[PDB]
Design a binder for this molecule. Structure first.
Ligand SMILES: *[C@@H]1O[C@H](CO)[C@@H](O[C@@H]2O[C@H](CO)[C@@H](O)[C@H](O)[C@H]2NC(C)=O)[C@H](O)[C@H]1NC(C)=O
Ligand SMILES: *[C@@H]1O[C@H](CO)[C@@H](O[C@@H]2O[C@H](CO)[C@@H](O)[C@H](O)[C@H]2NC(C)=O)[C@H](O)[C@H]1NC(C)=O
Ligand SMILES: *[C@@H]1O[C@H](CO)[C@@H](O[C@@H]2O[C@H](CO)[C@@H](O)[C@H](O)[C@H]2NC(C)=O)[C@H](O)[C@H]1NC(C)=O
Ligand SMILES: *[C@@H]1O[C@H](CO)[C@@H](O[C@@H]2O[C@H](CO)[C@@H](O)[C@H](O)[C@H]2NC(C)=O)[C@H](O)[C@H]1NC(C)=O
Ligand SMILES: *[C@@H]1O[C@H](CO)[C@@H](O[C@@H]2O[C@H](CO)[C@@H](O)[C@H](O)[C@H]2NC(C)=O)[C@H](O)[C@H]1NC(C)=O
Ligand SMILES: [Cl-]
Ligand SMILES: [Cl-]
Ligand SMILES: [Cl-]
Lengths: 340, 340, 340, 340, 340
């Protein structure tokens, strides 16, 4: 008596057609759809995508499924019979591969109300493409989106829109190894315009922000300490070559070991990012110290009072000058990549 | 005569409906379910998940499957006919992908008792999501959970609960490369509250604890020895520059090679973890030794008895002072990350 | 009334045969096909392939599907019934694995016009093979192609050709971590000639160009600075051994650390590429400096005015000579790998 | 006439039931099963498993398949009809995922003899779990097993046992990158005892032994040479600081580069293994040399004949003493990890 | 009229049996099969296998498919009906996993001639196992094979043999990152001998040869230059300790950085290969230089004319002697691993 009523309502007896939309040749059916995120993030810059495991619930009205000769309000449909009912041809416009779940029971749910409203909730795993710009690495902000588009019905037939109360929700307690999923989501429309017509799609923009604290005390702070070690070489008496050449070349070797050793941890983009500018300029100052003494030793190597006054003068200017240049670069750097 | 009785009991003749729950419009069916773990652990911080291969056994009562005209107690059902019987819509609320096993025979088992009790044991492989907080790395304790939730039946229809005697069991002899699976499991309820209603779920919490002994004698001990090597530089006569500058800068280069060389082994989280604080402070002391001599050489470089007494005094304070500071940090560190 | 007309037109009543081509034993059917690229690039030199997610639309004429007793022009066909219609046996001649998409609905679309024209749009994910020549790395240009070939029909039966207006389109906003997808695509024919006959195929050539800016300020610039550091060793007075031997051997160790440290980032090809020539020659000059002083110290070590004039002369030639040789190599290098 | 006899023998006419075991309510059916290994080894300590591609042949007796009205002895069954015959519910108790092979034909084989004997040979690919203990790395011996267990039939119904002549065979010419598959296999029983009853399983134990010769001349020999380089520092006159401090600290830096450079090659276990003890003790001796001179320079730095006799005495003891300590550790090490 | 003749010839009307071989109880059917290679090579020493994407065409004679009442010669069969015809049970004896292709149409082709000849061409992707011996790395030659074996028919029923004109072909333009696919293929028989009987198989041997040019100018040449840098230490006056100890220990540190830095690029085999012998002996000579001076300084440290003549004599022998030993090893090495 429960399940032999859906065969009466969608079988060969009644004239329900599974591949004809509700309100056919009439108003476009409204689909109120909302997303719950269970798991989030296998965020990779190698393939420029991420993964998300969602419950997708989508609700519409099918007037040829209304009924009154059955006692309760809601009447659910078995997941093996979902080819017997109309469903929207929703797909995800930026997916790179996705699947259902079928463990211990097929994880699908459809529920027809007494009104004729249909609630359809599924649980799917998604590999969604979001392009990334790592020009501001590590202090970069990513925006990975999630588009929901009709595949074959235009907006004169099918209209997608978000739920009013809460569209996208995220299960609390999730943790990303790189990013922080911002709590404010950005719901937008993305309505497609092709020669076939206007196709509906609605997008959810997720804001990601990279944590920087590892790259501070593993890349930035040790390089800044090595630059200070090259600044030590200016408070040393001249013509003492092996205690000032060896210091200045050892800071070069330690900066080179710092930059090359930190190469396998940073991503494999092949363009200039904001940590490579720090390593490059912090190499140019450490190199600039030994190049400075390479000038000073040749100036004072000839031998003249002007030569010691000229050598002393160069050191006097240099001792003060290079922390000022590193301070101007140090202000312009963090304003440029951090402030904006 | 054995298998032609289940067709008599669940066929077109008898009125058994496969998608109507037992005790329909009555009490919620109890599901006594328990888990045996065969394999455990492909634990990854990159995707924040693990893998587990389980036998899931779940037992319930179906009163419209009781019988008396068959000689033995237990009557098993073929795995090809499992669509002919009601099964709970159990799913795992934190899975990221999961599958059955079908090699040489589909690894499913259903057994209907003479009482009407149904035993249903399957063998499935799971990729379950557990978020991790590596702030206390390596001396961190993880808690990876395992939730068992009804998908479409509320608690007025279906109730999950663990077995009384032993719910979760783990096959002895398993070994993880990183963690130690604790023998005490934490069985809890997790009962979900949605606008549809209260959905049953039961969770098993597994406690994991990371082994640290590699990071002692490969990261902690060599860094502590390099800090002692920077402490050697204080028991050296002053104005002997290349035997004390070169020592102090070589300890910097060896600490930098130690920290950058140990970078590819540690995980790829982008925030401050407890081994990065050890490498950072053990870099600040080794740097602080050469910065200390960079003060001492300029104090004693001018030339005055006060200058040698002032230089000697600084060395006298420093020789004693830096093992005290490393001892205070060394107590606060291991209490802070190890004791709590 | 909509969907019971396609059963009238392609069912057992009408004599439509699904595996007989249109215009059978007549003219070859024209297939106007065009490609829209959603996602592009998991470009790997390890397996010599890439990935692309496309909409493939292909249009042909089937004269035994024309109709007039139905009100509208276009009449769409359900994706479950696509075995009931003829489709071209198009495959991709350089694929290494590929699949469809079926999430929330099978992502296929077929539309029969009143004229008898059939539009067939699908959405498939592709792993396409393109062989790469990394001899000019990093300043190399790749050309990865995309072939569309008939599988069993010769050109006397089936002819593929691109759409006139726009054949290949790429969704704007895509970003590759290594390359830049050039905006000018190269549409060609590739017509196959076998003993069975001439098989149609049409190819789209995509031009990729590698970004170099990382390898400038991480590989090229630090090596050039180390070569300048070996040039510093010539403006030093002779017979001062430990300040000139230790400098020259420390530049060797820093160049060796630069070359070996940059090894895990560059690809795993086992042949000579254009960055290995830079690292090799920038090792031969840094080695050539200490080998030069290894000559100079033995010339001036014996003791004669000719010996100091001969030593001074060698330094005089060397001080000027090695930046000229590095300038000739530096012109020939960037013309040879960058200009052509 | 060949294939229309199996439809006579297992069809709707004859009373063969596919899901009722032979000799039902009688003796347990014997399954003589044997394994041929084609490929072996994707041995990973990350997931604690390996892969093996086998032919599994299993033979049993089915008395209701005996026949006499057909000319030849053996009568084979088509792989599409294997649901029409009883098969054992064998599974592998330590698999983590496994599949069949179906390329160009489904790779299954069943052959019914005139006696009623059934031979069933399949070809399957296996990911089998074996836990590993890398405490003795590299000179460790692993034992990876392979269990064959009935899934739903107890030992009162089904009994597995190996073939007498040769149970497990391995195709000659296989090569592992890490291990050596020992030629002596260890056939055992593993009979399971559950509350349902005794379930049959038979296991094959494979003995693996790791090759060590890479870790000799890449980890052990260079570290031993660096320890000898620290032993060089004792045959040097005292108060010659920069030629003995710089040697002793350069051996520390070279040992640190050796240990940190060899870190990415060794596995990612997080506990103390036998190569980490070698690197740790070979770091403690190289550190102990400079700590020894850090004592000697302070003893002889004050100035007294007793001080030079005390300094000379310390060197005299140390010159002899540290190769004896490294010899005692060098005997205890290789006996402890290599002999047992 | 085209496709309703194959139903007349292989349907329920005619007595064609799909699982009975042609010429049953007669001569063994000949299968003339040939292979075209589209893509080749995901060659991995970790799993000891490679990948290849082939067209497999196989031709045989089926005398109960000959016809004369149809106008043309060739009559093709639909890929959905391939279970209606006999096909050989060919499989690949060294595959580790393999699949078909089904994109836009199932990529299979069968064509029945008027003679009764059947042509069957498919397109499959293969992971084929070839064991590798990296003892001669990098100058090693691999031989990866490809076996085609009958699964259930002996040689009294089915015989495989290659095509006469061209059996294996490779699509031009392919590029491997490591190897060079040799143009001369080695076609062989491999006929299997089991207790069931003789099973046919035919194999194609592919010869691979590794390119070495990367390992020359990245591993061999820099190590040889460091050995020359240790040869520089012999043309230096004795009793000049810090300019000859520091040189000789810096060559040790640079050789250690060269060997440990080149470790992550070379494969993960755990046995002695031919580049590890080069790095080991090039470490023993660089170590042997400082050990030589560690003898010389103790000989000349005591003080005697014999001591300076003995010291000078040792240097005199050593200056000449070590390039001779490196020349003997350098001849024996390249003859031993390169010539044979
Ligand atoms: C889906 O939503 C749209 C938007 O409200 C509905 O279209 C409106 O229908 C009312 C009828 O009272 C008109 O007054 C509006 O002008 C329509 N808005 C449009 C066309 O943008 C549409 O009816 C809804 N679909 C269904 C099946 O009810
Ligand atoms: C599942 O377990 C619950 C909990 O015991 C059962 O509900 C109880 O039924 C008894 C009837 O004697 C009542 O007295 C209790 O108040 C009920 N507890 C509740 C509602 O929390 C329920 O009957 C069981 N299901 C079945 C099918 O027996
Ligand atoms: C597919 O395109 C070809 C190329 O136009 C068509 O073949 C031509 O048919 C016209 C008939 O008016 C001839 O004059 C040309 O010589 C043909 N060109 C050839 C054979 O290269 C073909 O008819 C088209 N297919 C269909 C079904 O219309
Ligand atoms: C499977 O093997 C067992 C072991 O031989 C058989 O059981 C034996 O049957 C003989 C009958 O002559 C008894 O004497 C033994 O005591 C039995 N051994 C036991 C029960 O351990 C069994 O019959 C075999 N199965 C079949 C179908 O023949
Ligand atoms: C497959 O090839 C074999 C080898 O030629 C054929 O066997 C031969 O048949 C001729 C008949 O004229 C004999 O003279 C040879 O001695 C046979 N050679 C053998 C048995 O090795 C066989 O007939 C072929 N199969 C078919 C179906 O024609
Ligand atoms: Cl150094
Ligand atoms: Cl280094
Ligand atoms: Cl590294």
């Amino acid at each position: 008596p429960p399940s032999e009523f859906l065969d009466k309502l969608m079988g060969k007896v009644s004239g329900y057609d599974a591949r004809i939309r509700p309100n056919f040749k009439g108003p476009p059916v409204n689909v109120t759809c909302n997303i719950f995120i269970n798991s989030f993030g296998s965020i990779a810059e190698t393939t420029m995508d991420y993964r998300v495991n969602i419950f997708l619930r989508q609700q519409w009205n099918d007037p040829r499924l209304a009924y009154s000769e059955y006692p309760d309000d809601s009447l659910d449909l078995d997941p093996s019979m979902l080819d017997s009912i109309w469903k929207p041809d929703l797909f995800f416009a930026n997916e790179k591969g996705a699947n259902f779940h079928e463990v211990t029971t097929d994880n699908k749910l459809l529920r027809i109300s007494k009104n004729g409203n249909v609630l359809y909730s599924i649980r799917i795993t998604l590999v969604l493409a979001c392009p990334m710009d790592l020009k501001n690495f590590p202090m970069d902000v990513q925006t990975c989106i999630m588009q929901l588009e009709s595949f074959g019905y235009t907006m004169n037939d099918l209209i997608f829109e978000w739920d009013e109360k809460g569209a996208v929700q995220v299960a609390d307690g999730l943790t990303l190894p790189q990013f922080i999923l911002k709590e404010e989501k950005d719901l937008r429309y993305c309505t497609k315009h092709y020669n076939t017509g206007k196709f509906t799609c609605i997008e959810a923009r997720f804001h990601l922000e990279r944590q920087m604290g590892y790259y501070l005390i593993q890349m930035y702070i040790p390089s800044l300490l090595i630059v200070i070690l090259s600044w030590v070489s200016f408070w040393i008496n001249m013509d003492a070559a092996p205690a000032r050449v060896g210091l200045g070349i050892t800071t070069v070797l330690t900066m080179t070991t710092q930059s090359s050793g930190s190469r396998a941890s940073l991503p494999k983009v092949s363009y200039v990012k904001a940590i490579d500018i720090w390593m490059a300029v912090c190499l140019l100052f450490v190199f600039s110290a030994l190049l400075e003494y390479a000038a000073v030793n040749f100036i004072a190597r000839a031998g003249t009072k002007l030569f010691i006054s000229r050598a002393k003068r160069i050191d006097t200017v240099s001792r003060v000058a290079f922390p000022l240049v590193f301070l101007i670069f140090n202000i312009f750097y963090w304003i440029t990549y951090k402030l904006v």
